Amino acid sequence: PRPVVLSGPSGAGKSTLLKRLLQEHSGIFGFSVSHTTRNPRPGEENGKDYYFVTREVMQRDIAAGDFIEHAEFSGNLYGTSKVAVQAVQAMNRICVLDVDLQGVRNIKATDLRPIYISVQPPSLHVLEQRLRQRNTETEESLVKRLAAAQADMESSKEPGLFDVVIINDSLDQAYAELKEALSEEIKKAQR
Ligand SMILES: Nc1ncnc2c1ncn2[C@@H]1O[C@H](COP(=O)(O)OP(=O)(O)O)[C@@H](O)[C@H]1O
Ligand SMILES: Nc1nc2c(ncn2[C@@H]2O[C@H](COP(=O)(O)O)[C@@H](O)[C@H]2O)c(=O)[nH]1
């Protein structure tokens, strides 16, 4: 069962869409718990949304070869450990990845063989509106996520990087498209 890489610009709505997928289809989808050095937001939980560690612990894991991939985004480090992917594969479920555009390029070089799905905002205007709506970032880190949005939206339209592109306008509309886009993986996971 091919893993699923969900990417796109920060604030498009991919975490929101993914939580709706993991809640409805918990028996077939498993979430890859990434490591991150950023502070946890209210509502997040260590070992579930992220492995929240300090930069020192993060760098030590890198020196120990713990990560399939890692990258820096808006002044913080993020990584997909080998453990995160094997933990889902040891549950016989579809490993779903939430990574940035640099994470897509890293995973592209691996043997994971995933299906790559871009989640796009309806426009750059709605993207900025969603980045500020979440309200979980300081003003300097908010602008840094805005700076990377343009190049992330462009690359989100390239077929060399993605197999599916979904416009997250309405949540109900985007969610049905994602499920339909994952029909072949849901089929393989259930058989
Ligand atoms: N289809 C949508 N319509 C309106 N708001 C949305 C939609 N999808 C997500 N949002 C809002 O955008 C904000 C950021 O979404 P999030 O899932 O964190 O995006 P990402 O995971 O891509 O960074 C959240 O507050 C969420 O409520
Ligand atoms: N390369 C990479 N990016 C990640 C990983 N985990 C989260 N990200 C990305 O880092 C950015 C920051 O997300 P947030 O800080 O809102 O959780 C998002 O683009 C998210 O997809 C990861 O393990 N690897």
Determine if residue 80 is labeled as part of a ligand binding site. no
The answer to whether 71 and 79 are in contact (CB under 8 A) is yes
Domain ranges (residues) in the chain: 4-190
Q: What is the dihedral of CA 93, 53, 100, 22, to 10 degrees?
A: 30
Instruction: Tokens for 101, please give them.
Output: 């555009």
The answer to whether 35 and 47 are in contact (CB under 8 A) is no
Residue 129 Cβ inside 6 Å of ligand 1? The answer reads no
Region of residue 147 (phi > 0: left; psi between -120 and 50: alpha; otherwise: beta): alpha
Residue 168: HSE in the Cβ half-sphere, 13 Å Cα cutoff:
27
Determine if residue 27 is labeled as part of a ligand binding site. no
Token look-up 């713990």 returns 66
Residue 14 Cβ inside 6 Å of ligand 1? The answer reads yes
Q: Quick one: angle between helices 183-190 and 171-181, nearest 10? A: 50
Sheet of 35-36, strands arranged across: 51-52, 35-36, 76-81, 67-73
Residues carrying an active site annotation: 41, 134, 145
Q: How far apart are CA 19 and CA 163, in angstroms?
A: 21
| Measured CA distances, 45 to 40, 49, 52, 100, 121 (Å) | 7, 6, 9, 20, 26
Sheet of 164-167, strands arranged across: 29-31, 94-98, 4-7, 115-120, 164-167
- Closest ligand to C-alpha of residue 40 is 2
What atom of ligand 2 comes closest to residue 98's alpha carbon? 21
Q: Quick one: angle between helices 124-134 and 139-147, nearest 10? A: 150
Experimental method: X-ray
In this structure, the strands spanning 67-73 and 76-81 are antiparallel
* Residue of 64, 40, 70, 72 lying closest to 144 (CA atoms): 72
What SS3 state is found at 138? coil
In angstroms, how far is CA 166 from the centroid of its own chain?
14
What SS3 state is found at 137? coil
Please state which architecture CATH assigns to domain 4-190: 3-Layer(aba) Sandwich (3.40)
What angle (nearest 5°) sits at the alpha carbon of residue 151, between those of residues 149 and 157? 105
Residue 139: HSE in the Cβ half-sphere, 13 Å Cα cutoff:
0
Q: How far apart are CA 32 and CA 67, in angstroms?
A: 12
